[PDB]
Amino acid sequence: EKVRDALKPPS
């Protein structure tokens, strides 16, 4: 259930 998340900035 616990999953890591990778984000990305717009620019």
Added chain:
Amino acid sequence: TENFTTNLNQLARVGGIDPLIGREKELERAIQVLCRRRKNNPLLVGESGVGKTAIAEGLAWRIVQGDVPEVMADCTIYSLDIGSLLAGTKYRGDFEKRFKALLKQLEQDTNSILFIDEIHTIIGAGAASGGQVDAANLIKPLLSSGKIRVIGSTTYQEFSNIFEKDRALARRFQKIDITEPSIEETVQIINGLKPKYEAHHDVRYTAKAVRAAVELAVKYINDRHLPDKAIDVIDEAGARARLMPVSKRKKTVNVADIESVVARIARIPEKSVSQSDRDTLKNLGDRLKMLVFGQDKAIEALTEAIKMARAGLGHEHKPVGSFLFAGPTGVGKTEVTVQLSKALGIELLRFDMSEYMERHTVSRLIGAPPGYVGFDQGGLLTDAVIKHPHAVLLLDEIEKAHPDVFNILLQVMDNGTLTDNNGRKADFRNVVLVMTTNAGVRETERKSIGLIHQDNSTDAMEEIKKIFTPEFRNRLDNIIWFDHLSTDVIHQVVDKFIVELQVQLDQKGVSLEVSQEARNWLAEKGYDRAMGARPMARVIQDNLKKPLANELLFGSLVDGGQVTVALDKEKNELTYGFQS
């Protein structure tokens, strides 16, 4: 916290939370626990539907009204929803973020209290997958230190198995046993709740109806507990009053309406619950007497036992009646049972005791299918009585039954309630109990082996005394002997069979003129001392119906009837008249 916790105190101001009636002892114990320096977390352990959640919600209602001590004033109860807290997390720390935030709020307010219904769930992983970071572990330090106060409601079974396994969390909580108060206190509770329910359905509940609901629920609705069951029948009664009448009909909920609602829940025919059977009881003896001839002392005994139970003289805990039928086969033992069932309208459950002869098969009657298999099965006897509260249990060839079966009946007759291995409580106090045995007939019919014929008048009782234990016989109301059918009563039996055939022929248009002399000859062949009247079925059908029936389908006379019968001395045959 924004949506997970609903402020019960604020909710009570508007409504929703119904008033709590008479739980001072429970609330006093809870208020005392909440005032503790440490581990001030009450736990409400009780059976389902016994007001576990009303006490917690009711405490908020009582606080608003100022019916609590000054120390507990200015206190807000919060009702945490575990499902909402575990919905939408989808991340490593979403659950801990929101859960910890709730604790910060509670820590900020010294008087804030958290009400967690079904607290057994927190032990189960809230948002932990292959990990032990659960909701319970997070709150363990705070409960020990008195930072937050938590109220929990859980069932005894859940408390015993789900809860109490982690001795850590169990230690913080103080068990408060919540049990149903009484059959009479529930009436007071419904009175306090009656205005809210009355307003919803725009009806008024009669004082007799509310008392009847509780009393009627206990007799039939045994699966659930007293507070919830009584309220549920009340709720359903108002709804039926809303939909059944179109308009300008009686708004008041009558006592008869309560009986209809409880009947459908219990799947009862709705006739037994009512007390309008007095008319049938008036002439029950005479009506049954004409149906079955001879053995009058048996019909009067049966009617008298039923009549007393419906007049308030019945046994408080025992069944309506326990009887043993000792007589020859085919002497009307099963006739009084079936005819009684038909007139009363209740079912006639029949169990063959020849099948239950060995020890391994006794468990079937008082046990679920072998091992732990089968769904709504239970004991073969238990599901029949539970299904039909008012019935006529019939057992044939009880003497053949294994001794262990008699031990089961001892508690039935002595206590009136039977508990299945599964765990359910079967209460059958209305069912009459009848057993049929042929123990004594063998001794009485057979003559002594000697030149002198010894007296066999008392021999029949001696066999029953040794065959049936004294404890078993003592519980029985009376032992009634079915005596051999004398020639006088034998004439009535043939009259009933021939008249019955005449009724069937009457619709078809055929008529019969059987002679009285033919009746005598039919009786000798039809009735046997050893087999009783069981062979008499074939004699009437074969001698009278079969020759005429063959002719009716295809014969010299296709139709018109007007048949006659007379005894033939030389041929010992019955005459057949064919007039078109």
Added chain:
Amino acid sequence: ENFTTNLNQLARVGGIDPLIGREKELERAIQVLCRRRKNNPLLVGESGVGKTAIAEGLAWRIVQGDVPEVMADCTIYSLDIGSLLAGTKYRGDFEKRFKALLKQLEQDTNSILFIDEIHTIIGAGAAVDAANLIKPLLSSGKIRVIGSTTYQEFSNIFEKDRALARRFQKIDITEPSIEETVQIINGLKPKYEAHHDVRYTAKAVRAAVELAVKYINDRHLPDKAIDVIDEAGARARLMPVSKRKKTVNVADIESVVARIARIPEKSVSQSDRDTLKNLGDRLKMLVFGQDKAIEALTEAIKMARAGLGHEHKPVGSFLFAGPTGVGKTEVTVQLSKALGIELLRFDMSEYMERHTVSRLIGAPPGYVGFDQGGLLTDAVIKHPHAVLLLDEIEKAHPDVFNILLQVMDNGTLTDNNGRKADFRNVVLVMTTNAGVRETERKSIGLIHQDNSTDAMEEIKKIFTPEFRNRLDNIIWFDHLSTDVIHQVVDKFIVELQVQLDQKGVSLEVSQEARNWLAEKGYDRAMGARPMARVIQDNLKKPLANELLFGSLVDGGQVTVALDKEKNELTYGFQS
């Protein structure tokens, strides 16, 4: 609101067929919906029964106005599980959508959320979900939720949990009666007919319901009835290109059911008179042995179907006895093949252990859902209109015989599962090898004595006297004759000839070889069972070896004969 679809608004614009029947079930839902607490109703019903449609009927009542004023302004919605689970890919994303819809529904009062197939969303199940948000909406009492769940998966999801069962009221939704179902078709007839402008005769619609339950035995008759009706109408619309057969008849509906059933049209068609009339002729064609038994048995079947005014008892209760493999089983399988029913096989010898008796009516080991249940009772429910074959009935425990008496007399059987079987249509047959065993043994005496005994007396020793009186007629096979066995050899070799025909090689067998193979292969004690072993190893081994490597690789042209002095077969092959 985008996920769900408002049924109340749908009725205003049409597209909802007028519900017919289920007045009591529909009225029950309204009564519970008006409750202060536990208002949330449940619809425990099997697939195809019509549990989804009854909820739609409620919306029509609101629009019609034939309900109390409390529900006159109420609205109903249908939760679309597919819409919510469309592209989330993570558990918990689904939950967020459910919460948002609940808030939208919560703001407006008198809103009912009809959750079709509620069992899927809640509970772990067998073959995903969270079930965390269904509990708070029930406890809050804000919005009523109508949940449709099957009988199966309801005991393992709702009865196991108190929270869901406490807030849900159980409504038993049984299948409608045959009379009630045909009335529904009449109600739905104008909508289907308007689509393709064909007129259905009353006989065809009534026949469809009666025949569908008898043959399909897959799902409940309400769904099956609408399928065959729509299928026949669609087929009739485009079946003839040149001819527009606007009329409908029983002929058309029969073919449609045959296609889905995948059974011959003659058997599926209501041609019971035709099939019974030629039952013996069809059976006698394939098998020409034991004509005496066939004549008695064939007549017993025709009279049995009539029932002689008694239908509750099983129609077929014939018992067969005699030597093993002398036609005891061939007649049963060939009887089913001609009828087209699915033959079932159970060997009582295997079920000669008390533990095995429980297997027939349940499972001794713990099972989840009791899907397997009884080995025989479940099969009867699966195919009620099928023959039941029993082998070696003699070698069975005494208790098993008691159960058999109830079937023929009571006409119904009750087990741990509690499923009821309509034994009326069910047929039964048994084979007894004990009789042949009595003649095979030799007496303890200086000179042997005739061991032939009456068939009736033999049965009394092994069978209770309370069974032969309830039976129709006893059929016994004494032994085969030289002319019958000799002809059978010719029939069996044809299969080898047909097998060789595809391979491209011919075969020739001398008449002398056929006669010799019959005496050795046939056995009085074992009937014709060893004949297959004797004939196969004799003929198959030499031909198979040569066919692979030898002159017989292609062409065939074989010849077989036996020398008189040798009294042994000789095989000749030509390249």
